A paper describes a structure:
The second region we identified was a “tandem site” that comprises two directly adjacent motifs that were both conserved: a PRM known to bind CrkIINSH3 (consensus motif: PxLPxK); and a putative binding site for 14-3-3 proteins (mode 1 consensus motif: Rxx(pS/T)xP). This tandem site was found to be conserved not only in vertebrate orthologs of PEAK3, but also in vertebrate orthologs across the PEAK family. For each isoform, phosphodependent binding was observed and the PEAK3tandem-pS69 phosphopeptide consistently showed ~10-fold tighter affinity (KD ~ 0.16–0.78 µM) than those of PEAK1tandem-pT1165 or PEAK2tandem-pS826 (KD ~ 1–10 µM). We also solved two crystal structures of 14-3-3ε: PEAK1tandem-pT1165 and 14-3-3ε:PEAK2tandem-pS826 complexes, which were lower resolution (3.1 Å) but similarly confirmed phosphorecognition and a canonical mode of binding. In each of the three 14-3-3:tandem peptide structures, no clear electron density was observed for the adjacent CrkIINSH3 PRM likely due to flexibility and crystallographic averaging. Proteomic analysis of insect cell derived PEAK2IDR1 showed phosphorylation of the tandem site 14-3-3 motif (RAASSP), whereas phosphorylation at this motif was not observed for PEAK1IDR1 (RANTEP). PEAK3 appears to be unique from PEAK1/2 in its interaction with 14-3-3 at the tandem motif, displaying ~10-fold higher affinity for 14-3-3 (PEAK3 pS69), compared to either PEAK1 (pT1165) or PEAK2 (pS826). For PEAK3, the pS69 site is sufficient for stable 14-3-3 recruitment, whereas the longer IDRs of PEAK1/2 are predicted to harbor additional 14-3-3 motifs and different mechanisms may exist.
PEAK pseudokinases regulate cell migration, invasion and proliferation by recruiting key signaling proteins to the cytoskeleton. PEAK proteins are a unique group of pseudokinase (PsK) scaffolds that can self-assemble regulatory networks. In addition to the conserved PsK and SHED domains, all PEAK proteins have an N-terminal intrinsically disordered region (IDR) replete with short linear motifs (SLiMs)—conserved sequence motifs that can that form dynamically regulated docking sites to recruit interactors involved in PEAK signaling. Here, we elucidate the molecular details of key PEAK signaling interactions with the adapter proteins CrkII and Grb2 and the scaffold protein 14-3-3.
Author numbering:
A (entry chain B): 67 to 72
B (entry chain A): 33 to 232
The structure:
């Protein structure tokens, strides 16, 4: 579960 | 009253806030793991100290998120002209509601998830009708939305369908995107592909 990176 | 932000200002501020949040979110996950480990393993004073900490961290997070959402709803998404910005702010609304749902309880959890899904759906309708399938704001929406599904809504089915769709629409359009435009998007696509191959 990897959400949009900074 | 209203406020409009250039793309670059938007990104600056968004990055800054995500820095803060993510620090607090990861800290929260760690405190909870310690909490569960001790809670299964007994201990008087220590469990009190940990619970009080987790509570304080939840408080900070909810305060920051709620302030973020109140400025979004009050000043930014009313003022949004372009379609990329509309999608941007509605996706942000989804993100901060989702982080609310990440630790929220019972009916507060239910309200947060509902608001997040409304916001992501709004972003989606605009992204379909105004943004190329390779647009990074659209690929970010797709990724965070499918994650929303899988983790919060616990619909692997629907998360994976959303991720695959977004990936393949991109892959399709890819042979027809510029150089300085394609290097601005590869990393989101690979993240959607990674999440997907994970979810099987």
């Amino acid at each position: 579960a990897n959400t949009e990176p900074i | 009253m209203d406020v409009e932000l250039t793309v670059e200002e938007r990104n600056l501020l968004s990055v800054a806030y995500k820095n803060v949040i993510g620090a607090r979110r990861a800290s929260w996950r760690i405190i909870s793991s310690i909490e569960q480990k001790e809670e299964n393993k007994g201990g008087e004073d220590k469990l009190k100290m940990i619970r009080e900490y987790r509570q304080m961290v939840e408080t900070e997070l909810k305060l920051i998120c709620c302030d973020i959402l109140d400025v979004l709803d009050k000043h930014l998404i009313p003022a949004a002209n372009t379609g990329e910005s509309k999608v941007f702010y509605y996706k942000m609304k989804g993100d901060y509601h989702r982080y609310l749902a990440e630790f929220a309880t019972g009916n507060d959890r239910k309200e947060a998830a509902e608001n997040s899904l409304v916001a992501y759906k709004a972003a989606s309708d605009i992204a379909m009708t105004e943004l190329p399938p390779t647009h990074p704001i659209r690929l970010g929406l797709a990724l965070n939305f499918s994650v929303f599904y899988y983790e919060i809504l616990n619909s692997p089915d629907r998360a994976c369908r959303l991720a695959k769709a977004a990936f393949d629409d991109a892959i399709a359009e890819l042979d027809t995107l510029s150089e300085e435009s394609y290097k601005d998007s590869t990393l989101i696509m690979q993240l959607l592909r990674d999440n997907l191959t994970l979810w099987t």
